[PDB]
Structure formats: structure tokens, C-alpha cells
Amino acid sequence: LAEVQALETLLTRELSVFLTEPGSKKTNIINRITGKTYALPSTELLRLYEHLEQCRKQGALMYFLERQGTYSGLMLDYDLKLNTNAVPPLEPPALSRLCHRIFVHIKNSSVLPEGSHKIHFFFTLKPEVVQGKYGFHVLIPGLKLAASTKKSIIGSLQHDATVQKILHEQGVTNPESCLDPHSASVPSLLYGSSKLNHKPYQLKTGFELVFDSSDPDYIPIHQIKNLESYNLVSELSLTNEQGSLVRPVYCAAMLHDPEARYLHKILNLLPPEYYVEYPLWSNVVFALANTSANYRPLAEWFSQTGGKEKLEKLWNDASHHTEKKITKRSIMYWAHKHAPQQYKEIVEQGYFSILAEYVYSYNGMLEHYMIAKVIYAMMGNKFVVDVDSNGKYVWFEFVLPGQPMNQGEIWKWRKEVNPDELHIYISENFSRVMDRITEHIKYHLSQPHESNILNYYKKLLKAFERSKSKIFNDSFKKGVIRQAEFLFRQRSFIQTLDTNPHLLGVGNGVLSIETIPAKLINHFHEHPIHQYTHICYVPFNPENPWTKLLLNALQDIIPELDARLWIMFYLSTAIFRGLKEALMLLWLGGGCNGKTFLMRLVAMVLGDHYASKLNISLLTSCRENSAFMRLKGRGYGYFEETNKSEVLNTSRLKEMVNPGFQMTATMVAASNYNFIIDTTDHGTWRRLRHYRSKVKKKEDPRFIHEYIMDPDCQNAFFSILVYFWEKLQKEYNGQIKKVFCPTIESETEAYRKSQDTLHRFITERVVESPSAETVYNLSEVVTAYAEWYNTNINVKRHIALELSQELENSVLEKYLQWSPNKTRILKGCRILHKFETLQPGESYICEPKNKWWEWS
Amino acid sequence: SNVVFALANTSANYRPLAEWFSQTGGKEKLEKLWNDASHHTEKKITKRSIMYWAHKHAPQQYKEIVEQGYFSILAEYVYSYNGMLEHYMIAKVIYAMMGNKFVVDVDSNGKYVWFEFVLPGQPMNQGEIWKWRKEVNPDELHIYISENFSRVMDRITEHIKYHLSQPHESNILNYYKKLLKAFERSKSKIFNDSFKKGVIRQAEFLFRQRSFIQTLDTNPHLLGVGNGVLSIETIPAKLINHFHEHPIHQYTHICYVPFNPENPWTKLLLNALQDIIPELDARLWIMFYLSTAIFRGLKEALMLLWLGGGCNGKTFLMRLVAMVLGDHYASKLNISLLTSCRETAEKPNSAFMRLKGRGYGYFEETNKSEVLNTSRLKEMVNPGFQMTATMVAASNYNFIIDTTDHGTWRRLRHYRSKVKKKEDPRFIHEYIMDPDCQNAFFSILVYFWEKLQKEYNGQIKKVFCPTIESETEAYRKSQDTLHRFITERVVESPSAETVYNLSEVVTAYAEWYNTNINVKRHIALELSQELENSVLEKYLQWSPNKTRILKGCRILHKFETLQPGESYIEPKNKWWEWS
């Protein structure tokens, strides 16, 4: 706006030279919008008043105050409580009598000069009553009074019986206590200015009072007729001395700038009862971490009980967000839980306000982006959109319980190629806001103002009729959806979809295992997961008959030592995504054992989260992308099928088992009891584990036919799995530092010796002898290897290099030290000959049914 | 100079040059006159440099003049044509609005792809902060057309309403009334989806650059880091943290280089990567070659082999430089690309175009113990689509890459780790994943790159590194065969007047191999061409009889020793300082 631009230029270019320091006594003018204080000389005060007056006549937002100081015009601030929400009549006779009574107190102060003098009274009124609260200012700007005299006059006015009567007959219920006793000292709003939360007072009536010391009983108060002719900011100013209408008579001696956008945040932030916060103090400030200028919101929120803003430690001076924890939607869901109807009317008022400003900006022509903006304000908490792989904007819809799900997508995002719910929503729920717009226009029609406003409103309504029905058009709705695709963007939603390892998509909701207990998140959340498992359906962890039968038939069948928990500890941790221990299980044991029950039920309980029906050809491939990607995006792979009798399979398993795209683990392998998964390797892979089940009085086919079809059994088994998952890490966080079990490690070393070659060699023919001074060379070790292999297993030729590097890279590497001579000679070990006895000083190289858990 | 190459696109640039540089002081440009009319150059910076050189030094006046020009263009377009506004003039004002934020180019399939420059006040991915990102649709441009253009539309409407309330005759009043009515009818069109799509497809011809796709990351001295753009053109690192005309797209999210610090993390990394290996006179060539991975291409053609050690810092350093970089320089490169035959006899699978634009290749997985090395290594390591380098092969403790090779590959280097309490594998478990250690190692890498740039511009001309070359010739000794015979029977003997013929050397090599390794059939021509290109090439000259003569040398027989007159063929301070 031109006149605002003019005022901006005057303030910054010219009046900047009069800027005062905070608490300066020279200050006469305060701009509470810019937070600037000025000491303006009379010439520059007038120039200011001409600009403020032009801004006032165009309804511009002003918050200018003048400081009264010690000698200036009189201001009376009345704060009225009314009988009703109707503006009191306050007609000239009542206001005229008020002036007379105000004057009697001025006269009684004894400070008026002798002679004949005009003094002007101006009454500016609060534009509307709000909850029976009403106000007026009485300005006597020309009557220059000492601060002490003003205070005295105000004291007397509070107790005036005639004033109390007048106010009572106007419907004032606080006539004894409505006059602000600090009226003398408070900074006084310039005409056209107001607090940022209020609208400016409007000049209703002004009066001319003439007093004459020679004729004291003649006090004619002539109303002022040509008020519009004057600069009203100028004339009404208490500190001005260069008014045209108002000629002085000398008596004896923080920053908000909400831009109508964060007022909504204030309106939704106050209603919750969370003013004190013992468990959720941190959960509010990180919810405003997306907000850049959060200092004023936090100072408005958490600075009142009291608590000295927790000594202003500011969460260690504005701590950054650890991750994408929470946003505005967290506070949005913190409403609609305590005050649902208040939150609903607040958001509906905001929705109507946005649509009203769009309608009044462009009279009837409502287009695609306006509907897209109002829709984004409407369901921004429920839809997002991305460009995931092929550059196509796919939509993601948050699902609520009052919706048609698929089976179990109850509190998670679902992928859509077309927002069906948004298409229905634009036609149904947005039509209510359109009807509210029409009712507001029709209510504005039934108001008694001039004919040009009637014509403008009628043509606006006529233009809006053909746009109201456009929201049911298919092409218009498709264009609105395509336009809102740019507004619902997140730019990272696909990038972080299922990257959180401690989150699980369950048919009841979201399972979070960040801390020790299970949460089962069954409400609104900002966790951006989409993948889900409709079979899990976790009932926390009961101890009923079904889970008792599952634990009695699942465990307590395979024998174990000292109540071994490792086997289904490793069958657990499948609910984790990645970055875990890289052990691999071999279940080469049992013919009709649980290798078909456990190893399949643990994959049927999970879904697309962690289940990869991986065939044997990944292991049996000879030479060696596009093969294990079903394991890359998941965290469990398994090979259930019994394929052959005996094949060779080393392939690329040297990098498959260990990390190194994204690291993942928990592969369980079980071909059959046949001797399938064998190939001689010299990697000393301690990450390969093999357990043989000791079972083959009844086979119990009901556990293999239909019990794992039962959803309740799967829920109980998933409960057992998750219960042992947090039973794991609070005792042995990580399976490497778990308590040793002789059974599993004995079976692994027995299998490794069954692979023969290197481990049989340095476990039988070699004994660690620190007392042996005989230093063995690598060539002697290779010769002993060749002789022992020829005299023990098979006669064959040997080339020294291959078994030399095999011995140098075997378990014997601890015995091998980088000598100053830089040799791989053997130190602190001995080699045994045929039928050689080990010399002294050398070393070789309950189940209860009940309470069936926990170990020391 | 920068301003004059920026406005050298002006046909009459001398007049603005004299207008702006004859300015306190100036003194008629100090009587240089563009240094007496200096010669132009290649595609340097553009008018966006002067566009950027405002807005933080004098932002208020710059904003005022840009708003005034914005309003002037829109006022001309709404005055030449009465009230209606359509696609091309909205596109023209949009191009005037963000000509320095968006570009568009055609890349492969005839389609136009948009590239958007990013700012700190914008939702980025992790580290696209001062780099062009590829947008399938310019979402920010649609948003800016819908919202920010409405401010200029309201400015036009306010100007029209101001001109309406002026005292002239009723004909101009009626003209302004119908102009306001038509402009009000056309004002809501900027919120229409089809209108905005037309404006975007019209501005695709205005934001066109046409030198953007083919010059995107061809400059090797630029890195896309999480702080912005890292330039290694100068001796110190530049760290461009503002607007620039460098048109790079790919980035690295973890680099984040705050120069070279001396905090706890970089000191821990310095004590961790070295001082475990006993090095001679601060031997540092290994990580020196592990530097220069920030260089894109056109470098030396060396290759490092690190198949030594079982539980050493083998995969730790390789994977940590891999994590330090991103899609800039990383390639998992399963060794079956260069091992276990030439796959399906297919060179155009992976190979070069997997390493296209890359500057680091690495081979870590193991097939069994030993298969092959040669395959097509000789084709790929030679310069000839484009050429790139810094391949480090470190697969396992087993010697896997061992077949015959005698093409005197001086560009191959071998190294093993001399040092393999417990094993302490936590340096590969979770220590690499820390962003701070990756930042510190990128700082170390750029410090050692500029250390190369200061003293020894090229690793051929640097100080002598004995260990690697010894282990390298030791791996050449692993090949031996002819290499062995040359280092053995063949001896540099100048004072000797004897001249060795081709058949004599071939027979001597055959006899030495028969009495040394094994017995097999010999081909005189094959052995002659095999020994022709070996290290005795300098000692082989052209005979006057159009043959080859081996001069200034002697051939040792069985149990023959050296004859006189014949020759064969630690800082006290810290290690990373000057040496």
C-alpha cells in the first residue's frame, strides 16, 4: 500500500535519527510493531501525524503509542463490563454530561488559567463488545496538566456518583471500578492504533467546552460538527501543541509478527491442560523444531505454575532434533483428545477464514490452487505424496479406525495411485465450507448499508454460484488433486519409510521396541512406516493356555544344557531390520523335527517385513545382483526345501553371512538331515552355527497341519518372540557377549572337524607347548601336513604355496607373530608325531514345565 | 576481472566497464583500459555473479530495483495488451524472477528436465545445500507462481486502482475501468492448473541453458559436500558456501569438511590408520595413493594391491574411504568383473560405465582362494570410454590374483600389512558409522591432496618409496619366469665386448628354466618377443645388419657369480608433518 510505503520511508530514511534507547525519558513516540522508540521534535511529530492520518483513513494496521510524561493532555481509559453484548447507546446527552462532570474535577484541581479558554473532549469507542467487555477513551489533548494533577482528577472521577449513574443507565455493571487509575501514566494509543490483538477505537463524538473565570457558572459544551476536516491523529494527540482545532491551554504545574498464521497455533496451544509437564516437557519443544522462529512461541508457551522457564536453560540452548520425531501434527493430535468440539470449531473458523480471504481477493472465480490450499489445510495430517522411483507422484494415506482397512493397516500409511478419500472429501466435506461461505455472504446481504455494497455483494454471490458447483466436476477435481500434489510434498517420505529398526507394522498398530517394554502404539503418530504384517496381531505377552501350549510344544522338546536359550534367541531378533550380529544357523539335524514347524511359523508370523522364500540355488550357484534383494529389504531369509542328497555350495557366502547396500542378518538354513551344505573352507568363519535337533512319543500332526493356520497361535508365538526379544538385550545386549552354552559350540566345532582338513590338523597333530624351544618353520609345517594327510586320509601330491598360505591364514595365526626377522615361524607350539602322547605342560588345541524362562 | 568476463556477453561491454571501474579512487581505472583490451576466454561466469553480488551487501536498494523492474515488465505486458494475461508473459516475469535459481535442459530422450538450485531455507535431502537438484516437476516454481506472483498481481491492481482515482476526463476513466475488469478476470488464471502447466511448458524455453547436461560434473576439481561445494583448484580448500555458477549435481552427504582440525577425532584417526604398521622414514605412500580419490579423471594410471593380512586394517580403510565418498566415488565392484573368465565375453557390462565418473574402485569379496587376474585388466588400466583410476584390490589373505603376466606393468603396485589382547574389531563394527570420523578423514584426505599439490605434483616424481616397490618387485618376483631370468643370468656388463644374439638369449633362458623350474617345449620367436619388451629394452640396440644386438651385458652360466666391473640389473616429531 502506497501510504504504508510512504510511512516506512519517513520512519527508516528520515526519523531513524531520533531513535531513543530503551527506557529513555526523551521518548515521546513508541512504534510497538517495529519495537522502535523516538524523541520527535514538534516539526517531525507533525510529519508523522500526516502519514499516520493517511494510513488511518485507509484502515492500515498501526500500533503507535505516545508517552504522557510529566506535562501533557488528559486521557481517561474506561474498561466496561456490560449487561449484554450490545454496544451501549452513548448518545450526545450522556457524553455531554460526562464532559461536564470531568470538567468539575479539573476545575476543583485549581490549576486552570484565568480568562476564557476552549477545551475539546473526544470519545473513541471499542468497535464491538466481546463477552460483555466494552471500552472508551476520553481524550482532552489540549488541556496540558501535570501528571500528579491527572492522578488527582482520575481519583476524584472514580468516586463521582453522577458518572456512576450515567454508566449504570448505559448497562455498565462495574461503574465503581471501570476507570483505569493509571490513565495518567500509561502510554496512550495514537488515534487509528491498537494492541495487535484488538481493533482501533473509533471517534464517535467530540465536544467543545468553553470556561470563563469571570463567569464560572456558564460552561457551554458545544459538540464539534466538522471533525472530518481536521487531522484526527494530530488533534487527538495528548503531546501535540501544533493542532489546528486543538490549541493548548497550559495549567499550573515482546515482538510477535504472527501474520495471521501463528495465531492459529496460539489458539490450539492453550486448550490442553499441559501447562505443567512432567513426562512431556521435552515433547513440546522438539515438536516446534520444524518452526524456525520458535523463540517467541516457546516464550509464550512455557513462561507461566511459573517455574522460571526451568531457569531458562532452553533445553541446553536450543538442542537440535535427534531425528524426524514430531512436527505440528503432534500438537494437532494433542488437541481433539481433551477438547474435541473446541478444536473442531477453531479449525473450522480457520478453514472459513482462508476460503473467505480467497473469495474476497478474487470475487467469484475460485480456481484449482485455492481449493488445493484449503484442502492442504484440511487434511495435511492424513496425506503425503512422493516421486519415489519413476518420477510419478504416488500418494500415501494415513488410515484411521473409522475407515475401511484392508486387513490390518490400522495406524500406518498406505500407498495409493489415486487419492480416493481425497476425491470424496473435496465433494462432501469441502461443500460444507462452501455453504458456510454462502451463508456468510447472505448474512452480509441482510445488512443496512449503501447500494454499491449491495451490488458488489450480489455480483460476487452470482459469480460464486457457478464456482460452487465446480467442485463436483471431475476435471476440476483432477486438476485440484494435481495441484495439491505440489502442496502435500514431503521430499523425504519415501527416503525414510521403513528405515527405523525399532518399529514394526502389526495388525493392532505399531510395535515400538526402542526401550525395554513393548508399546503397541494404538494412536496417532509421526512414524512414517508403510510396510505391515496382518498376521502378527500382538496381544502383549499373556500367560494363558494357548501360549503355554506353544511354549510346551515349541521348546521343551529339543534337549539342551543348563536351560539353553540361544537357539530361539537367534530365531528371535528377526523383528530387527539390520545392523545386528551376523550369525548364521544350520539346522542339519532331525527328520520330523521343528525345522519344518519353527522355521516356517517364524516366517508365517512375519510378512513382507521379514520373510524371503529363498531357494537353494542362492547357495548352490558355482559362479557367484537381482538375487538376494528380497533379503536386502528384509531381515530374515530361509531355505526350507529339501533339495538333493549331496552338493557343493560355497558360492558367494563369504560376503552373504557378514555385512558388506544395507547390512542385514538372521538367516537360518535347514535343507534336511542329508549332508548337503558342505564345502571345505579355510576362512575360520566363527559366524557359522550348526545345531542338530536330538528328536526324530507321538508325532502330533495337529501342530503341523492346522495349528499354524490359526491366527491366535500366531499371535501367541509372536508374543513369545517379542517377549524373549526384550528378555535378550537387558541381560546380553548382542549375541556375541551372551553366556556360553557347551551344546551349540560343541556341535559347531564337531561339524567343523567333520569338514576335516585344517581343523583336524591343528586340533590333533598340533598341541600348544610354551615350554617347547623347537621353533617350527612354515615349510616343516607344510611337510608335516603332507605326510600326515598321506598317512592318515589319502595319498596325493602337494604344492607348498596353497597350504602354506592356508596355514598362515588359519586359526594358527595367534601362534604366528611378526618376528624381527619377518618370518611366519611357529612359536609356543608343538607338532605331535604318530602315536605321540601329549607331554606335561602342553595344552590341546533342570527343565521345568512351569516358569520355563530366564537364566543366570 | 570477474565482472568483465561476467558481462563480456554484452556486445558493447566497454561502456559499462568505463562506467563502473572509472570510480574512492579509481583514477580512470588506474589507466589500464581492460589491460589494453584483454582477450576473451571460455565459458566463464555469467550475469548471475553480479546478480548475486548484491542482496547481502546492499539488499534493500537491490530489492527495490528488482521489484521496480518486476512491476515494469508486468505493467508493460498489461498495457500493451489491455487486460488479459496469458502463458508467455507470465513465463517471462517468472524467468526474470528466478533466472538464477532454475535451469532446464534436454538430456537423453528428448524430454526437458528441470534443475533447481537450493538454499538453506528449503527442505533438502541431507546435503544438497548449494547444488542443482533434479526435479521431475518444478514444484517450487508452481508454488511460487501461485503465491508469490500474486503479490505482483496485487501491485498491478493497486496501481490500476490508483490511476482510476485521478482527475482526468471520463474516457480514460472508462478505459481504466474496462482494463481493471479484464485484468481482474485474468488475475485468477494464475491459480489454474492448466494455465500453470502452460506457463511451465512455456518457461521451459526461457530457462534453457543447453550447456548444462554435457557440462555437469566434467570439472574434476569440484566436490559436492554436505557443506556445499569444495574446490581444490587453489592450494587451500575453498569450501564454496554461497551462490555459484558451478553446475554440479551429484553430492556426498558425509564430507562436511571444516578444514583440517586437531580435535580428538582426527587425532584418534591419525593414531589409528598408522603407527600400527612399522614404516621406514615415515613411509606414507599407501594412504598417499588412497588420496587423489577426490580427483575425477585424467590422472596417473597406478593400481594398488593390498592382499595381505587376516584381521588387519584391511576392509576398514577401504570401506571407510568408500563411506567418506558417495555416488561421487564408490563402486562395490565384485571381483568376478575381473576374475573367473571374462564373464559372458562382455566388456559393455558394468566395467567402465560402472566406474563412469568414479574415482575409486575396490574389490573385497573372495571367490574361493585363487582364480585369475588378467581377464581384461590390461584393457581397462590403459587410458583407452573416458579414463579414471585409483583402483585398490584387497580381497583376502589368499593370493587370488595370480596368473601369467609379462607386459612389464610398472603401473602395478603390491603391498601387504605387516601387522594383523583381543582382535578389537570395533573399529569396523561401529567406529566407521560415526559422521565425525568420516568428516575428519575427509579433512585428512583433502589435506594430503593439497600436500601432493604443493611438493610433488605427481606420484612418479615424489620421494622414493622403498617398501611398496620392494613388495611390488617381490610380486613381480611372484611372476618371475623371464623377470627372474633377467634379474638372474642377465647382468649389466659394460666393459664386456661380447654381444648377445637373440637365439643365444633364448637358449640361455630355456636352459635356466629347465635347470630351475620345469621342462616344456620352447618357441624361439615367442621367447624372443617376450624378452624384447622386458627391462633389457634399453640394452637392446639396432644392428647395422637390420637385426637386434644385446650390448653392454653378460649372461651368467651355471654356478656363475658376479665379476668385478659388472652391476646388477625416522622423524622425532609427528609423521604427518614435513618430511
Side-chain angles (χ1 to χ4, degrees), chain A residues 335-353:
Chain A
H336 209 49
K337 244 176 80 190
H338 322 135
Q341 73 274 37
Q342 170 265 332
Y343 153 81
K344 178 226 74 59
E345 61 76 15
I346 289 312
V347 297
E348 273 278 349
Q349 277 319 108
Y351 285 146
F352 160 70
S353 306

Side-chain angles (χ1 to χ4, degrees), chain A residues 386-668:
Chain A
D386 260 347
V387 282
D388 62 329
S389 87
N390 326 306
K392 274 311 320 173
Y393 287 77
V394 303
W395 284 78
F396 289 98
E397 169 188 348
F398 202 74
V399 196
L400 291 201
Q403 282 202 221
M405 281 85 67
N406 167 267
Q407 201 293 333
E409 34 195 42
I410 183 60
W411 286 100
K412 348 183 185 63
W413 305 90
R414 61 167 158 206
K415 179 158 125 34
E416 289 197 312
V417 315
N418 216 306
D420 313 277
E421 295 285 331
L422 208 48
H423 269 266
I424 300 177
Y425 199 82
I426 291 169
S427 298
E428 311 275 310
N429 291 79
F430 185 71
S431 90
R432 321 278 166 81
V433 184
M434 288 301 226
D435 283 12
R436 281 269 307 278
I437 281 314
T438 61
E439 274 143 295
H440 170 76
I441 294 160
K442 287 181 164 3
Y443 155 72
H444 268 186
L445 259 284
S446 279
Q447 297 285 83
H449 41 57
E450 49 260 37
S451 189
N452 53 76
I453 314 182
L454 259 280
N455 192 16
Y456 159 67
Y457 266 119
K458 262 175 211 274
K459 67 168 42 68
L460 178 127
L461 196 47
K462 185 188 66 158
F464 187 67
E465 291 325 322
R466 62 188 49 66
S467 81
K468 178 157 63 89
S469 92
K470 247 150 62 189
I471 66 182
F472 295 89
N473 188 266
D474 171 48
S475 295
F476 188 84
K477 279 163 70 154
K478 193 150 61 51
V480 159
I481 288 313
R482 285 205 265 108
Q483 205 55 55
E485 265 158 21
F486 309 134
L487 221 40
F488 282 89
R489 263 310 280 277
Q490 210 91 324
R491 206 94 56 176
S492 70
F493 187 64
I494 277 284
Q495 215 249 31
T496 165
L497 205 58
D498 315 82
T499 196
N500 214 3
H502 321 270
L503 286 184
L504 230 53
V506 190
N508 291 104
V510 177
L511 202 54
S512 163
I513 42 187
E514 282 161 312
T515 88
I516 293 193
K519 321 320 161 163
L520 195 38
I521 300 178
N522 209 353
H523 46 268
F524 187 84
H525 57 90
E526 314 230 11
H527 303 129
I529 56 197
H530 154 246
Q531 298 248 75
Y532 82 112
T533 318
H534 38 68
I535 312 106
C536 269
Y537 225 80
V538 47
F540 262 50
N541 183 41
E543 300 309 308
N544 73 92
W546 256 108
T547 204
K548 161 160 54 218
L549 163 154
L550 265 300
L551 75 98
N552 284 358
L554 169 73
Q555 193 35 266
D556 284 336
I557 49 145
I558 40 155
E560 73 273 74
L561 271 165
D562 62 278
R564 184 255 324 254
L565 298 214
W566 180 91
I567 172 67
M568 72 76 87
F569 268 1
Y570 183 57
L571 257 301
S572 162
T573 79
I575 60 185
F576 225 70
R577 298 275 209 286
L579 204 61
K580 68 199 153 182
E581 165 61 27
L583 289 163
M584 166 135 169
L585 200 35
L586 314 183
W587 216 300
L588 215 162
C592 212
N593 60 313
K595 84 183 173 303
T596 82
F597 166 71
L598 181 36
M599 192 205 158
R600 166 182 78 188
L601 180 63
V602 81
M604 290 276 187
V605 153
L606 311 172
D608 43 353
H609 262 297
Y610 328 92
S612 311
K613 192 233 304 193
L614 270 188
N615 75 5
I616 308 299
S617 66
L618 258 286
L619 329 168
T620 65
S621 49
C622 297
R623 291 162 74 255
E624 313 149 78
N625 188 74
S626 194
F628 81 119
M629 337 322 296
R630 31 195 173 276
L631 194 130
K632 175 64 61 154
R634 298 192 169 81
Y636 193 129
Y638 73 131
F639 330 106
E640 191 156 20
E641 60 268 310
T642 168
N643 38 302
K644 337 311 317 181
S645 170
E646 171 83 57
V647 282
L648 286 184
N649 41 10
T650 199
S651 320
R652 47 192 306 175
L653 299 182
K654 293 130 292 304
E655 95 262 2
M656 181 96 78
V657 53
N658 44 81
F661 184 59
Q662 196 43 63
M663 324 316 188
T664 181
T666 324
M667 301 66 78
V668 184

Side-chain angles (χ1 to χ4, degrees), chain A residues 362 365 367-370 373 387 391 393 482-483 486 489 491 654 683 805 813 816 818 824, chain B residues 125 135 137 139 142-143 146-147 184 187-188 191-193 196-197 366-367 397 399 418 420:
Chain A
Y362 327 104
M365 323 86 71
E367 280 277 357
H368 295 46
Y369 186 81
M370 302 145 188
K373 177 74 78 154
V387 282
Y393 287 77
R482 285 205 265 108
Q483 205 55 55
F486 309 134
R489 263 310 280 277
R491 206 94 56 176
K654 293 130 292 304
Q805 64 211 91
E813 65 101 18
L816 299 188
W818 224 242
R824 269 321 201 192
Chain B
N125 254 28
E135 294 261 39
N137 255 268
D139 313 328
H142 279 261
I143 279 147
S146 279
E147 281 156 320
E184 271 257 29
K187 187 147 69 104
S188 96
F191 293 86
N192 189 261
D193 165 60
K196 279 170 64 154
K197 194 181 304 304
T366 305
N367 197 63
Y397 27 67
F399 279 178
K418 31 226 177 181
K420 44 216 155 298

Side-chain angles (χ1 to χ4, degrees), chain A residues 358-388:
Chain A
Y358 266 141
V359 157
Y360 278 106
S361 292
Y362 327 104
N363 307 33
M365 323 86 71
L366 227 64
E367 280 277 357
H368 295 46
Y369 186 81
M370 302 145 188
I371 319 294
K373 177 74 78 154
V374 183
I375 281 303
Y376 174 70
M378 211 155 288
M379 292 176 58
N381 316 277
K382 259 193 82 163
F383 281 78
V384 293
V385 59
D386 260 347
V387 282
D388 62 329

Side-chain angles (χ1 to χ4, degrees), chain B residues 320-365:
Chain B
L320 155 54
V321 194
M323 289 324 91
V324 151
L325 317 153
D327 60 337
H328 260 276
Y329 321 92
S331 64
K332 52 181 178 179
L333 283 197
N334 63 85
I335 213 157
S336 34
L337 177 46
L338 213 75
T339 312
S340 73
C341 315
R342 308 168 41 184
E343 32 187 0
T344 50
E346 176 97 312
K347 183 68 172 188
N349 196 289
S350 65
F352 261 82
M353 321 67 68
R354 179 68 177 282
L355 222 56
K356 170 169 214 48
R358 234 75 62 198
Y360 197 126
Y362 53 75
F363 321 94
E364 269 64 29
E365 90 292 333

Side-chain angles (χ1 to χ4, degrees), chain B residues 1-2 4-5 13-14 17-18 20-22 26-40:
Chain B
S1 42
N2 260 350
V4 71
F5 326 100
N13 54 88
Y14 301 94
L17 158 76
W20 91 271
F21 213 38
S22 324
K27 304 105 156 173
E28 209 253 322
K29 314 148 292 283
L30 283 184
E31 277 96 333
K32 312 186 201 79
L33 277 297
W34 194 15
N35 287 22
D36 321 328
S38 313
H39 181 327
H40 315 133

Side-chain angles (χ1 to χ4, degrees), chain B residues 186-201:
Chain B
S186 147
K187 187 147 69 104
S188 96
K189 278 197 288 197
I190 67 176
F191 293 86
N192 189 261
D193 165 60
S194 85
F195 187 91
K196 279 170 64 154
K197 194 181 304 304
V199 166
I200 289 317
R201 276 188 286 111

